[PDB]
Structures are given as C-alpha cells and as structure tokens.
C-alpha cells in the first residue's frame, strides 16, 4: 500500500486542476455512456420530466499514467475534487443534483494508460415542451441535451462511447401513463456567439396510454350524453322531469370540461379531448333544445312535436355513435 | 415466484419464419423485464433480445437485429419472439427468462431469476 | 503545460481577491451579456416569473495579463474562487441559484490583455407585479434588475456589451399562456442612502392568449346565460320547471365567479 | 475573516441570505475603524393574527432583532437615525393589505441567561374588503335575496317553493364551509 | 410613459391652508410611488414627501412634518398635498413626481422618471 | 422531419415591395424557430431575420432592419417576409430555414437542420 | 395599549381562601401572557405565577405552588387568582401584569409592559 500511496502522491505532485489534458494541444475526446435507472415523473403542467441515471465519462489524462502497477485503480470518490473533470452540463435541465448518501455517488477508476472513468448518479428534471393538440392520443419527444459549459470544440470533443449501444435502461423505464416506444442518440456541434461547442442529444418518444382517461373523462362524457337522451322516452307533458334531465346533464357537462382542463397546462389551443367534450356538449344541449321546442309546439303543432320525439330517439344515438367511430379513427 | 413455459419451437428451413411464445404465471409484476437467450451445442449462452413491462421498449443483439421481433401481450401474460429470414447460425435451444426490477444489465444471464425449459429450433439450409 | 502552470502560479502569487482592478483608481467597466434559455413559469398568484439564462460578464484585471502565450485561456470553473468577480446581484429576485451539475456551471476565459469573461448559468424567480385590471385581455411588464451590491459608481460601472444586441434568446421563449411582444434594455444609475449604484434593466412585455379562458370561463358563462333564457319558451303554468331553470342557472353563475377568482391573487 | 455581530431574528421561521451571483453582503471600512456590514435577507417571520374582526380586521406583524450570545454587558443596539432608520415601507405592495403605519422600538429583554438588547420593527396591515365582497358577501346577499323570491309564488306551488328553500339552504352551508377553508 | 399635471397653487397668507392636486395619466402602474418636491428661488430642490401605490404608507420631510398631509385616490389617478399652517419658508414652486417600482431612495430627484410643470405657492 | 417550400420571389424595381412566403409541413413543432438567409452571387450567406414559435418575438439584421418585417401564421404553417423600399444590395437568393428548440444562436446557418430550395429576388435600380 | 384593573383583595384569616380578579381592556391580543406579582412591605417584587393566552398552560412559584391556582376566561377578558390555605407570609399588594408576545422570561418584571394598581391582601 505504501508504494501505491507514494505513486499517487507523485501523480498529484504538480498536477494543476485548472488545466485540461493537452492544454495547448488537440481537444480531449470525452466518451459518454448512460445507464437509465428510471423516469420518476412526467409533468404536462410544468412541461418537464424527472430522470435518474448513471452518467459515465471517459477521457485520457497522461498526467495520471502509472507504469509499475498491472491493475486498474478504483479510488475513493473524494479524488474527483483534486482532478480535472469535464465541465459537462445538461442544457435543458431545470433542477439537477448528484446523490450524496451515504457518500457522494461518484466513481473514479484509473488505468495505467492514463484513462479515467468518471461515473456520477444524477437525477435531473429537464424541460420537455409538449404538443398537447392530439391529447390524450398524443405522443411527445423529450430530450436530454449534453454539452460542455466553457470549453469549445477547440478544447473538448464528445462522442457516444459505443455508438447506438451507449445508453442502457430504456427497458427499465416504468411509467403509469406512458410507454417509451423508441429512443435516439445524436452527436452535433452547436454554434453560440462565444464559439462552437459539442453536444450530445438523448431522445425518448412517449406514447400515452388511454386507460386513465376512458375511466375519468370519456365514460362520464359518453354516459352523460346517454343520460340526456333518456328524456326522449318520456311523454312531453312531463315538463319538470324533462327539464331536470336537460339542466343536470348540461351542467355536469361543463364541470367535466372544466375539471378535465384542470389537470393540463394553460395552453391556448384546443385538445382532441376538448373537441370530444365540446361535441358531447352539443348533443346534451341539443337534447334540451329539442325538448324546449317540443314543449313549445305541444299545443300549436301536436302532430309534429310527437314526431320530433320519435325521430330524436333514433337520430341522436346513431349520430353520437357514428361521431365516435369517426373521432376515434381520426386520432388512431 | 414465477413460472415460464415456452412453445413454438420446431424444424424450419433456411430463410423461413417461426414464432416462439412464452406464457408466464405467478408474480409477473415483480419480474417485469423479459429476455430471450439461445444456446447452441458448442457455443456459450447468447443474448437474443429483451422487452419492457410496458412492451414499448425493446433491445436486440446485433446478429439477431432486423430479423427478429419481440412483442408483449400483458392481457395473456405472454411474450412472443418472431424470427424471420432464419439462418443455420440461429439453430439453438431458445430460452425465456424473467428479470427483477432492479437486477442490473439485460445482457447478463446471472441477473435473471426465473427461466423456462427451452424449446429447440433447428434450421436446415 | 508546466510553463503554463508556472505562469498561472506567478499570476496568482500576490493576487488579493479582496481588491478590485484599479483599487484606488477609476471604476471598473463591466460588460453584461445575456442569453435567455427559457422562461419556465409565470405566476399571477405569487406575482413572479422563473427565468433561466446564461449571464456573461466582461471586465479587465491587469493582474491577469500574460505576454508569452498567443491564445485565450479557458480555465477550470474552480478558478473563480481565487479571482475577483463583480458583486453583481438581481435586485428583484426572490430565489435564484447557479446550476451545479455535473460541475458548477461557470466559465472563465482569459485573454493576454487581462480581460476576463465570466459566464454563469442562472435560474431566477423574480418579482413581477401584475396589473390584472384588464385580465384576461391584459399584458404585463416583467423586469430583471441587475446591480452591484457593495461597489458604488466610484468603483463599478455597467454597460450592455453590444448595446441593443446584448440580450439573446427572447425568440426561444415558449409560454403556454403568454407571448413576448417586445423587450427593452436600459442603463441607469440609482441613488440609495449608501451611495449611487449602476443598474441595468432587462424588460419583457407579455401578451396573454385568451384561448384558455374562452374554454374555462367565457363559454360556460355565455352558455349558462343562454340556458337561463330557455325558461322564456315554456308556458307560465310550468312553475316548477321555470324555477329549476332560474335557481340552477343563478347558482352555477356564483360558483363560476368564485372558481374563476380562485386561480388569481 | 472578521468579527460580525451575532444578530438574529427572534420570530423568524425560515430565513436566508441571497447568494447570486455572489453572496449578497457588503463590507465598507473607514480609517476610523468603523465597519458597515450590509446583508440582503428574506425572512418568513411569525405573525399571530387576531381574525375576530375578519375581514374588517387589521394585524400587527413584527420583526424582532436581537443578539444570540452577547448580553447587554457586551452588545448594545440602537436604530441608526432613530425614526428614519427604516426605509421602503412606501415600496410595499400587497394585493390584500396596505401598510397604515410602522413603528421602531428599542428594548432590553431579560432571559435566564442574562439581559439582551432588542429592536422591534412593526407594521400595521389594514385588509382591503374588495376580494371578499366578490367571493363571499355578494354570493351570501344574493343567496338571501334568492330565498325571498319564493314569497312571490302562490302557496299552491309546493314543489317550486321547496326548491327555493332547499337549494338556498344548501348553498348557504357550502358558502360557510368554503369561506372557512381559506383561513386557519 | 406617464403625464403629470398639477393645480391648486396660488397666493396664501401666513398660517393659511392650501390643497395641491396632481392628476396622472398613462402607465401609472409602472411608476407607483409619487413624490412632492419644492424649489425655492435661491435654495436647491427640496424633498417634501411621498406616498405609496396603496395610499396607506407615506413619508415626509422634517420641516414639513406635522403641517402637511399627502393622500391618494386611485379612482381618479390623483395625489393630493394639503398644506396647513403655512409659513413664508414654504414659498416655492411645488413639483409632482413619479418613481419607478425599483428606483432606489425616495429623497433623491434623480430616481424619479416623470415630473409635472410645477405650480407656484407664495406665502406673505 | 420537416419540408420547407418558398414562393413570391421575382423581379422588382428599386424602392419596390415584395412578400416572400414559406410553407412548412411535418414535425414543425420540434423545429419552432424560423430564419431567413440570403445568398448574393459573390458574398457569403447573410442572416436576414428570424421569428419565434409564438410569432411575437423577432430579430433582424442591421442592414435589413426597418425595411423588412417577418410574420407568422401557425394556422397555415407559414412564415412571411415583407420587404419594403428594396435596394439593389438586397438582390440575392432568399432561403427559409427551421431551427431546433435547443440549437444555439440564430445568426449561424450551421444550427438550422432544414432548409428550402431558395427563391430569387432581383432589384433593378 | 392595555388597561388592567384588579379586585377581590381584603382581610383574610390564616388558612383562609380568597379570589383575586383582573379585568383587561384594549389590545389584549398583543399582550397575551398574564402574570401575578406580589410586593411585601420590606421585600422585593416576587413572582407568583402566570397564564397563557389559551388558558391551558400555567406556571407558579415554588412558595405559592399547590396552594394557588390561576385561571382565564377570555369571554370576559379576565384572569383569576384563587389563593387557598393562606399564610401570613402571603401578605402583600398583589399586582396583575401583561407581557408582550416576544418579551422573554416570565419571572422578570422588566419585560411586562402593562400593570394594574394593585390590591392589598392581609393574612392575620
Ligand atoms: C419482493 O420482490 C423481490 C424481487 O422482486 C423478492 O426478491 C427475491 O427474494 C428471493 C427470496 O424470497 C431471492 O431468492 C433467493 O436468492 C438467494 C441468492 O443466493 C445467491 O447466492 C447463492 C450462494 O452463493 C447462490 O447459490 C445463488 O445462485 C443461484 O440463484 C441465482 C438466482 O437467485 C441464480 O442466478 C444462480 O444461477 C443460482 O441458481 C440457483 O437458483 C436458480 C433459480 O431459478 C435455480 O434454478 C438453480 O437450480 C439454483 O438453485 C445466488 O447467487 C438464495 O440464496 C436463496 O436460496 C434459498 O431458497 C432456495 C429456494 O428458493 C433454496 O433452494 C436454497 O437452499 C435457499 O434456502 C433464494 O434463491 C431472490 O434472489 C430475490 N430476488 C431479487 C431480484 O432480489 C423479495 O423476496 C420480495 N419480497 C416480498 C416480501 O415479497
Ligand atoms: C417596463 O417598465 C419600466 C418602468 O417600470 C420601463 O423602464 C423605463 O424604460 C425607459 C425606456 O423604455 C427608460 O428610459 C430611458 O432611460 C435612459 C436612461 O436614463 C438615465 O440615464 C440618462 C443618461 O443616458 C440620463 O440622461 C437620464 O436622466 C434624464 O432622464 C431622466 C429620466 O429617465 C430625468 O428624470 C432626468 O431629469 C434627465 O432628463 C432627460 O429626460 C427628461 C424626461 O425624463 C427630459 O424632459 C429632459 O429634457 C432630459 O432629456 C437618466 O438618469 C435614457 O437614456 C433614455 O433616453 C433615450 O430615450 C428617450 C425616449 O424614451 C429619449 O427622449 C432620449 O433622447 C434618449 O434617446 C430613456 O429615457 C427609463 O429610464 C426606464 N425606467 C425605469 C425606472 O426602469 C421599461 O421600459 C418598461 N418595458 C416594457 C417592455 O414595457
Ligand atoms: C426529437 O426531436 C429532435 C429534434 O428536435 C430529433 O433530433 C434530430 O434527430 C436526427 C436523427 O433522428 C438528427 O439527424 C442526424 O444528425 C447527424 C448529426 O449531424 C451533424 O453532424 C454531422 C457529422 O457527424 C454533420 O455532417 C452534419 O452536418 C450536416 O447536417 C447539418 C444539419 O444537421 C447541416 O447544417 C450541414 O450542412 C450538413 O449537411 C447535410 O445534411 C443536410 C440535412 O440536414 C443535407 O440537406 C445535406 O445534403 C447534407 O447531407 C451535422 O452537423 C447526422 O450525421 C445524421 O445523418 C445521417 O442520417 C441522414 C438521414 O436522416 C443521412 O442522410 C446521413 O447520410 C446520415 O446517415 C442525421 O442528419 C438531427 O440532427 C437531430 N436534431 C437536433 C437539433 O438534435 C430527435 O431525433 C427526435 N427524437 C424522436 C424520438 O423523435
Ligand atoms: C405592535 O405590538 C407591539 C407589542 O405587541 C407594540 O410594541 C410596543 O410599542 C410601544 C410603543 O408604541 C413600546 O413602548 C415604548 O417603549 C419604549 C422603550 O421602553 C424601554 O426603553 C426605555 C428607554 O429607551 C425605558 O424608559 C423603558 O422603561 C420603561 O418601560 C419599561 C417597560 O414597560 C418599565 O419596566 C420601566 O419601569 C419603564 O416604565 C415606563 O413605561 C410604563 C409604560 O406603561 C409606565 O407605566 C411607567 O410609568 C414608565 O414611564 C423601557 O425599558 C419607550 O422608550 C417609549 O417611551 C416613549 O413613549 C411613552 C408613551 O408611549 C412616553 O411615556 C415616553 O416618555 C417616551 O416618549 C414607549 O414606552 C413598547 O415597549 C412595545 N412593546 C413591545 C413588547 O415591543 C407595537 O407598538 C405595535 N405596533 C403597531 C404598529 O401596532
Ligand atoms: C322556436 C323554438 O323552438 C325555440 C324553443 C327553444 C328556443 C331556444 C332556447 C335557447 C336559446 C335562447 C335564446 O334567447 C335564443 C336562442 C335559443 C337557441 C332559442 C331559439 C328558439 C328556440 C329553439
Ligand atoms: C481494466 O479495465 C479494462 C477495460 O477498461 C479491462 O479490459 C481490463 O481487463 C482491466 N484490467 C484488469 C487487470 O482486469
Ligand atoms: C481570443 O478572444 C479575442 C476577443 O478579445 C478574439 O479576438 C481572438 O480571436 C481570440 N483568440 C483566438 C485564439 O481565437
């Protein structure tokens, strides 16, 4: 152990953390490698998602080469503070941290080559702008943009270590409301006023499951429409009964359209759900206007009034049924 | 615990197709990820592919990539493996495995807790 | 590398972080430069907005000049702790932080001149008093007031580095409920009891989109009015029917006026 | 690397000193040896409220300033400039309140561990009624007027007049509950 | 922008009273604080007092303290200055100024962005 | 992916006006920012201006400033470029480009992922 | 401000009982804690006991402990002091005091802002 300690001290002696490898020379190739642990949350209201991952970085610092020893050296996490590490950050993160219990969750593994393996366990909540136009038959593209803060392409280069196999754990992701249909890795160089920087983009495509919404929105709407149509099977002389059917179904439809809109962000466009609820509103308000009209002609034109009821009993459900078939097909 | 049982293995001619099935019972929720491994007579256990609990995300070996597809149907607690454009290299006993939620990497057989008595697939050229 | 390390050590040797450039002499011109990443949120209830930005500062410290080297030196973020940096703060912030993952998000780029480029990635939630009189056909003026905490105009001066082109990213801002109609940069000197300090003001004008409210307030109201008027098309003898129309529409109108008022301050 | 007074806020629940871009603290020295130590602080301090007259009430919120360890034998406090020691009361803009006056006080309080210096900043907050006439009073007043419509229907309209009775009675309990939900 | 216009200045005898008015128009919300300054012929610009957007909180100069009161009526976008027990020392051109939300100290004229052409008050 | 197509370019006399259009299709949401570039025969690619997804905020080059206006109509997935008081200096092939949400600075052409085959604008004095 | 007035003091024989009352008016909410002090002719001010705004929690001096009880009735803005099994040592002028919400320790008289003109209790 003493020999190893001496070698480590020699490696540290004169090591300047301020200077990258090949300070004046070519850029440092940094290899990125990600193992996803989980996506803990996806907020449509805040348009972000919370990710948990093992973020590994590989580079070569010749100042950390050792000839004598024949094995790879795993050192205590506290060595990071006395080494140069890339200034890698997540461009589109809102709040991220590195886990601290029981010790700071960071790994350093050295090789006689001078190659460094720097692992971090990170949880990020990153921005994911959402196109809720087709909601809840939508899908989203959430990304994690990885870039260096200060060092330009003249000083740092990025690459996905292992190409398409550089990210793992997409298969582990378990979300109640979504499912990861595919993922993509990209490598680019982006140009700011301060210079050109390297970027890597991890992407997911989230397909939303409809299960939650058929229970909490669609069935209530569909059954509140069917409920409104019961008033067609009462004689027009039951004025108070048929107004209850009309008013209650009309009011319980607005409160659905409001309560459904309360779980979303305050977007200015209309969602596929908003149209569905809107049409449902039409069928319920029409069911009332129909009764109001029938009542208005019950002595003026009693023949017509009785015919309207007998037609409505068949037109309404058929139209509502065919509307559904068109609606679902348009969005599937 | 979990019990896995396979089916659909048989003799197929080269360039042919075949569909393997793996029916699961018991605590399927505690072992969400499912994997496919194959064992040739001479070679070591090879990773074929694996699928998520949601069924959306998959992962395949390079050799098997673009010629095989893994699908799920949680309604029937069954994962399927469709093997198209089969080669004689694919000849092996195909196994079906289930992995714990926090069991580490997909590629490694050690991590999988439950397996099923494999089905033979032979490919004549 | 060893030569560069030695030069850096020489630059540090005798450097006092307590003293600004030209300590007794003229003030230090500091150039500000902002690149907006996003406005993440705008709260009418808390009268604040959350901003994310790259905050760059440029000044000249002659103690950091190097003749021998012909290129600009990007140093590790940890050098900030052993240099003098301006005591710049955001006057109207409620809670701000500097991103820490994977390393503290700060950049230092040196020039042989002695010029320093100090970049920080910051998210602020800053106060934005709102005039909701014309709500929801209103628009607001949210600002970010930049000033030095301790150093007066005798010691520090501010300027927007590049004038009107000093801020970027207003075009990147994507808010569900608002849209940025214009922005303005200003430079002023404000006078406190402790002295006169330099200030820079970044301003946005937020025009609210009505889409959300026609769905959640206006249509319910408009249709609840139309619903009340159905009772006119029933004969006067239908007393109970026409009282249902009256009572229900009256009660569902108060609950709209209450529920609409619940999303505001 | 200097001695600073151990000044704290007795009635704070959670306070911090702003950190961006640098810690918001100023030191200005004079050849005299006089120190000016400025801090930018946000405190959330306790303000026990007498809601008996709510919402026509007013409250007295304070900020009690004291030294933690040093007694009057070691520290003394005074409002530098007397009544002119506090500024910015005029800047305060609250949607629901308005600052009618403020007061500065200097006292010495006695604990078991000794006598310590204290300074008390006080505000008097007068509540505006605008919010409550919209969300409580008008609904109540109109729900009463609505109940009285049933007097203008003939007594034979039994179901009509029970609707007026029941609905107005139930919508009154839900107001009394929903109004009580925004309070402690 | 904001436009301020004053009125009510005139000749008054010592110990008398007078009420100055200042009507505001435009972006009154962006410049919430209002201040009163006076300029004697010989002396420099003097701070009289100032009032908050809510109208509750005020602040007065020591000389003017206890003899003047500033009030607000946001219904009419107007601030008032009632000057009672007037002295010949009070003789000056009284100005009305509007201050930005984050403009620093009240006492200093520099901070105020908008002013109004003052009204003369003379005390014999 | 995104497809951009322009129109409205032609011959115009100096001091004249002209309106260029750029119709977009496909994943327009993933590339929210739109930019205008022009290429004279001899000179390098020049930045003209750019517009936000909301359509509110814009940015123009100094040369083109006060004589051109960029507008959006997301109803028709189209951005417009109105060029008034045209100079012979403005003669060039005007291109329409779309930029990713996180693609860095507007001024730089490298960042834009999708372009459209440009339209010619010539200005005779 | 607050005004405190006491009553119920008089002559009592040893081992007897007596009930002192203290009626409060004004800003009673800003001075929630109430204390009882007694002053013998020769001795210094002695702490008797004190009671909370809620009326639940109390605190008594050792000498007075187990022979006296302090109670509250915020309905009448009044605190009571029942003194049972009285000794000649208890002879003194009993005072009623009100303490600010943040005024430090109960035992010390300095902290109490408002007092009432005491009532005499003599025990033969
Ligand atoms: C909540 O849910 C979690 C998971 O979602 C549950 O966790 C599971 O809990 C069970 C116990 O309830 C765990 O099983 C036991 O595993 C230990 C592990 O032993 C290790 O070391 C020994 C000794 O060196 C090795 O022999 C073991 O290697 C064998 O097993 C592993 C798999 O565990 C296998 O990969 C190896 O190839 C090897 O094979 C043996 O097991 C396979 C299994 O199919 C079998 O086919 C083969 O013939 C071999 O037997 C391993 O590295 C083990 O010691 C235990 O053994 C005891 O029970 C068995 C019978 O079950 C007896 O035969 C034996 O004598 C012992 O008494 C168990 O196997 C399981 O690992 C664990 N899973 C995870 C992912 O954590 C929780 O229990 C749930 N909790 C609640 C409350 O619901
Ligand atoms: C959101 O809301 C905030 C407020 O809440 C708005 O903020 C205001 O924004 C405007 C710009 O839109 C700012 O105005 C510009 O101010 C600068 C800086 O002014 C200072 O420095 C200059 C030195 O260059 C000094 O000369 C100034 O002193 C003069 O002006 C002040 C008032 O600013 C005045 O009190 C002094 O007596 C002195 O006088 C001159 O102005 C008066 C009129 O006020 C005039 O009568 C006299 O003849 C003198 O000219 C000061 O210390 C200033 O340089 C700019 O001037 C240029 O533009 C104006 C047009 O606006 C031209 O007239 C002029 O010739 C210049 O071209 C502007 O005045 C204002 O300061 C700022 N206020 C605060 C508190 O933030 C935001 O704009 C709003 N944003 C949105 C998006 O809505
Ligand atoms: C979620 O949403 C995001 C967007 O918001 C999606 O992200 C996009 O994903 C695609 C992949 O699916 C990315 O495309 C690929 O990009 C790489 C990298 O490109 C850079 O580096 C290479 C060097 O390695 C350079 O050569 C590239 O330069 C070329 O392209 C740039 C613009 O990208 C252009 O400005 C240059 O002039 C240069 O030109 C050539 O490309 C243009 C078209 O852009 C063409 O017209 C011209 O003729 C030239 O060929 C660049 O700097 C790139 O290597 C890949 O190329 C491969 O695929 C294409 C076909 O797609 C083949 O034709 C080619 O031969 C290669 O095989 C891709 O272009 C894209 O960059 C990325 N966008 C951003 C902003 O991140 C996610 O995919 C979405 N996720 C989900 C799940 O939906
Ligand atoms: C919000 O609510 C809080 C409390 O909940 C209010 O706080 C109170 O505010 C008032 C002022 O409005 C404070 O009273 C003033 O106290 C100061 C400081 O007192 C100390 O220091 C001075 C010297 O600086 C000493 O002289 C004082 O000593 C006297 O008082 C103590 C304590 O009562 C006593 O032990 C001593 O024997 C001595 O007694 C004198 O006062 C009592 C009062 O009843 C009187 O009976 C007796 O005869 C003595 O005169 C003490 O150590 C003090 O300087 C001020 O004096 C000035 O005003 C008074 C009139 O009010 C004049 O008489 C005097 O000449 C001075 O001009 C005040 O007494 C009070 O302490 C404070 N309490 C707390 C707990 O903070 C806020 O006001 C409320 N705010 C709003 C806006 O609602
Ligand atoms: C002529 C007739 O059969 C009457 C009976 C109910 C009436 C409707 C009731 C609801 C609306 C009331 C409004 O005042 C006018 C339009 C609306 C839509 C009315 C139009 C005329 C109708 C349909
Ligand atoms: C050190 O790690 C490399 C991979 O980085 C591995 O191939 C090698 O075998 C390791 N060294 C030893 C002695 O095992
Ligand atoms: C260093 O930065 C300056 C800006 O002051 C720039 O002009 C110069 O080209 C840069 N040097 C290099 C090596 O590019």
């Amino acid at each position: 152990m003493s020999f190893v300690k001496e070698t480590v001290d020699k490696l540290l002696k004169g090591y300047d953390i301020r200077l990258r490898p090949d300070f004046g020379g070519p850029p440092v190739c940094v290899g990125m490698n990600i193992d996803i642990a989980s996506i803990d949350m996806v907020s449509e209201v805040n348009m972000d998602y919370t990710l948990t991952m093992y973020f590994q970085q590989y580079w070569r610092d010749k100042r950390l080469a050792y000839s004598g020893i024949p094995l790879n050296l795993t050192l205590d996490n506290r060595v990071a503070d006395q080494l140069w590490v890339p200034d890698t950050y997540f461009l589109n993160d809102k709040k991220s941290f590195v886990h601290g219990v029981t010790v700071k969750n960071r790994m350093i593994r050295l090789h006689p080559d001078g190659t460094v393996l720097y692992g971090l366990r990170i949880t990020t909540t990153a921005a994911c702008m959402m196109d809720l136009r087709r909601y809840p038959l939508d899908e989203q593209n959430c990304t994690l943009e990885i870039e260096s803060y200060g060092y330009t392409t003249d000083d740092i280069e990025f690459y996905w270590r292992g190409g398409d196999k550089a990210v793992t754990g997409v298969e582990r992701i378990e979300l109640p409301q979504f499912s990861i249909v595919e993922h993509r890795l990209v490598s680019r160089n982006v140009v700011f006023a301060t210079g050109a920087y390297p970027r890597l983009s991890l992407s997911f495509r989230l397909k939303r499951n409809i299960g939650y919404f058929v229970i909490q929105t669609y069935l209530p709407c569909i059954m509140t429409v069917i409920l409104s149509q019961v008033s067609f099977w009462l004689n027009r002389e039951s004025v108070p009964a048929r107004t209850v059917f009309g008013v209650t179904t009309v009011l319980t439809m607005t409160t659905l359209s409001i309560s459904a809109r309360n779980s979303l962000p305050k977007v200015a466009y209309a969602t596929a759900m908003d149209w569905f609820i809107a049409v449902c509103y039409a069928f319920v308000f029409s069911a009332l206007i129909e009764f109001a009209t029938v009542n208005y002609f019950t002595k003026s034109q009693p023949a017509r009034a009785a015919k309207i009821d007998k037609m409505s009993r068949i037109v309404f459900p058929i139209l509502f049924g065919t509307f559904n078939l068109v609606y679902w097909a348009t969005y599937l | 615990q979990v019990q896995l049982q396979e089916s659909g293995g048989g003799l197929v001619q080269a360039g042919g197709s075949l569909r393997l099935s793996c029916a699961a019972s018991g605590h399927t929720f505690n072992y969400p990820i499912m994997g496919w491994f194959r064992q040739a007579p001479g070679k070591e256990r090879e990773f074929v592919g694996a699928i998520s609990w949601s069924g959306g995300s998959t992962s395949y070996a390079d050799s098997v990539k673009d010629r095989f597809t893994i699908s799920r149907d949680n309604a029937k607690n069954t994962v399927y493996l469709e093997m198209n454009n089969l080669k004689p290299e694919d000849t092996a006993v195909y196994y079906c495995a289930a992995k714990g939620r926090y069991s580490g990497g997909l590629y490694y057989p050690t991590n999988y807790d439950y397996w099923g008595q494999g089905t033979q697939v032979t490919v004549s050229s």
Side-chain angles (χ1 to χ4, degrees), chain A, chain B:
Chain A
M1 295 187 63
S2 63
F3 181 90
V4 177
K5 182 176 187 296
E6 293 175 11
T7 59
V8 172
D9 293 359
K10 291 182 178 174
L11 295 175
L12 296 175
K13 189 208 161 175
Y15 190 96
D16 200 354
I17 67 174
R18 302 185 286 253
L19 312 174
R20 69 178 178 91
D22 285 327
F23 183 71
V28 190
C29 272
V30 184
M32 305 294 177
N33 201 296
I34 299 177
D35 185 57
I36 290 162
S38 50
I39 295 180
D40 310 330
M41 186 202 80
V42 180
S43 180
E44 304 94 44
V45 180
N46 301 313
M47 287 187 176
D48 63 58
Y49 72 109
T50 302
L51 175 65
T52 305
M53 63 182 187
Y54 300 83
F55 190 72
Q56 275 91 19
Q57 309 183 87
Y58 307 69
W59 70 96
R60 183 174 172 167
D61 193 334
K62 292 165 194 192
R63 297 173 291 178
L64 310 173
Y66 54 88
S67 62
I69 312 175
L71 54 67
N72 302 330
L73 309 174
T74 51
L75 304 176
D76 195 74
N77 66 289
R78 283 160 276 178
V79 180
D81 299 319
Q82 51 196 292
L83 292 178
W84 178 88
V85 287
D87 61 351
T88 304
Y89 75 109
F90 306 115
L91 174 68
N92 63 318
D93 77 342
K94 298 186 170 188
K95 253 190 179 195
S96 310
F97 71 83
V98 185
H99 288 253
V101 181
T102 65
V103 182
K104 204 81 164 168
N105 290 199
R106 62 190 170 184
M107 164 196 67
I108 294 165
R109 192 175 293 168
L110 290 168
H111 306 75
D113 192 2
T115 314
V116 187
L117 164 54
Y118 182 47
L120 294 160
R121 196 159 76 93
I122 296 170
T123 56
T124 292
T125 86
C128 178
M129 299 311 287
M130 304 202 178
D131 179 1
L132 304 167
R133 286 193 280 282
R134 289 178 61 86
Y135 174 85
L137 299 157
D138 64 323
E139 43 189 307
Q140 305 299 340
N141 172 350
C142 298
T143 66
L144 180 68
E145 308 294 305
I146 299 161
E147 176 173 309
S148 68
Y149 192 75
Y151 289 110
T152 60
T153 54
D154 293 22
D155 302 312
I156 294 292
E157 292 284 14
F158 289 167
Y159 69 98
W160 287 107
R161 191 169 179 278
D164 289 340
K165 302 204 153 188
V167 176
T168 320
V170 286
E171 316 87 20
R172 264 195 292 276
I173 300 168
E174 238 186 300
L175 283 165
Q177 207 188 146
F178 298 88
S179 45
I180 319 304
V181 70
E182 72 164 318
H183 69 119
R184 286 173 198 165
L185 312 188
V186 183
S187 190
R188 273 165 68 91
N189 292 23
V190 295
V191 183
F192 288 91
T194 63
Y197 298 90
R199 183 169 303 183
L200 300 188
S201 298
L202 170 56
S203 313
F204 318 90
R205 191 140 76 202
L206 320 185
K207 181 66 190 168
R208 165 137 35 207
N209 297 330
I210 320 156
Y212 180 63
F213 312 92
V214 301
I215 294 163
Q216 265 215 339
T217 306
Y218 292 75
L219 285 169
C221 288
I222 285 165
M223 293 294 150
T224 303
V225 169
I226 292 166
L227 189 62
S228 77
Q229 298 178 2
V230 174
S231 89
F232 304 148
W233 303 85
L234 308 185
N235 173 233
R236 51 191 183 282
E237 294 181 333
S238 296
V239 175
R242 292 193 66 174
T243 57
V244 170
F245 276 102
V247 170
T248 60
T249 55
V250 166
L251 297 173
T252 60
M253 201 58 64
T254 62
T255 61
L256 288 177
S257 85
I258 296 164
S259 73
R261 208 69 164 76
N262 285 340
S263 50
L264 289 180
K266 307 199 215 303
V267 296
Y269 50 78
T271 78
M273 185 191 64
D274 295 329
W275 292 121
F276 183 81
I277 297 170
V279 171
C280 290
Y281 199 93
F283 280 73
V284 176
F285 208 75
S286 301
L288 175 52
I289 286 169
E290 182 273 16
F291 159 74
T293 305
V294 165
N295 196 240
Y296 183 66
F297 295 161
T298 197
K299 293 197 182 171
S300 296
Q301 300 158 28
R304 187 179 165 174
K307 190 188 191 195
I308 291 164
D309 272 7
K310 289 202 161 194
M311 290 176 64
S312 301
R313 291 166 190 173
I314 300 165
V315 172
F316 277 67
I318 290 169
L319 291 179
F320 189 61
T322 60
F323 162 70
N324 272 41
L325 296 172
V326 175
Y327 160 87
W328 293 109
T330 296
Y331 291 103
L332 298 164
Chain B
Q1 301 202 330
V2 171
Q3 300 104 277
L4 300 172
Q5 192 182 282
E6 299 145 47
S7 51
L11 175 56
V12 182
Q13 300 198 337
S17 296
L18 191 57
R19 184 170 205 171
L20 305 182
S21 311
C22 182
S25 68
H27 298 74
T28 57
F29 187 84
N30 297 320
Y31 304 94
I33 305 157
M34 296 293 295
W36 286 98
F37 294 96
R38 66 185 180 184
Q39 186 97 54
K43 302 196 169 193
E44 298 212 336
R45 192 171 264 117
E46 196 192 344
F47 177 73
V48 178
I51 190 162
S52 173
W53 181 246
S54 71
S57 188
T58 61
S59 178
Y60 303 97
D62 288 350
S63 50
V64 155
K65 185 161 170 303
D66 290 335
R67 304 182 298 94
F68 287 67
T69 45
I70 299 162
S71 48
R72 195 176 198 115
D73 183 11
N74 265 337
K76 302 183 183 188
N77 285 317
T78 306
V79 289
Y80 299 76
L81 174 57
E82 295 169 35
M83 325 194 288
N84 296 288
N85 185 26
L86 282 163
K87 302 188 186 186
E89 296 169 334
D90 306 352
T91 303
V93 182
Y94 284 76
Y95 286 101
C96 174
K99 188 170 81 66
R101 186 167 281 97
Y102 312 99
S103 293
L106 289 64
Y107 294 81
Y108 326 92
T110 305
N111 297 345
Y112 294 74
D113 290 352
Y114 295 97
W115 299 75
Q117 291 174 23
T119 188
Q120 185 83 55
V121 172
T122 55
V123 178
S124 52
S125 60

